[PDB]
Nucleic acid binder design. Structure first.
Ligand SMILES: [K+]
Ligand SMILES: [K+]
Ligand SMILES: [K+]
Ligand SMILES: [Mg+2]
Ligand SMILES: [Mg+2]
Length: 136
RNA sequence: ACAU
DNA sequence: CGATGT
């Protein structure tokens, strides 16, 4: 603790895993929805969590904001740190779109800088992240 | 085990 | 119960 309330919180939502994936980012303090990605027909939870963080980085950088990002995904936080999404999802025609977005997110990370802290949301202490989809 |  | 990940 404690929660850094001046922050952006992101989360994935899905219908199946693998399944339809979407994500959104919210103001941690107010819950205001700041961005929401159109659903992607097939992806994994972790790909979506990764895309949500990278989109947050891009959203904050464009707005000259130094706020941190919270994610509840140990996996996606590590993938962003490594600039490499180590997903097991088959690459095929059905998964081409999510894999294109993941490839492009990695490419963005490899061509841009940021100081944004990427912080673990401590669900066990604080409850569900503010960007959660309320589906579980 | 832990994080989803 | 199933799945994605370290
Ligand atoms: K949920
Ligand atoms: K969770
Ligand atoms: K497991
Ligand atoms: Mg999550
Ligand atoms: Mg959630």
């Amino acid at each position: 603790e404690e929660i850094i309330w001046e922050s952006l919180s992101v989360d994935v939502g899905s219908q199946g895993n693998p399944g339809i994936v979407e994500y959104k980012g919210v103001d941690t303090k107010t819950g205001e929805v700041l961005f929401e990605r159109e659903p992607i027909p097939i992806g994994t939870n972790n790909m979506g969590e990764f895309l949500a963080i990278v989109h947050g980085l891009r959203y904050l950088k464009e707005r000259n904001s130094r706020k941190p990002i919270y994610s509840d995904s140990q996996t996606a936080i590590k993938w962003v740190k490594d600039k490499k999404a180590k997903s097991t999802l088959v690459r095929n025609e059905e998964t081409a779109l999510i894999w294109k977005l993941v490839d492009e997110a990695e490419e963005w990370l490899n061509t841009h800088t940021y100081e944004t802290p990427i912080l673990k949301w401590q669900t066990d202490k604080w409850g569900e992240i503010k960007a959660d989809y309320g589906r579980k």
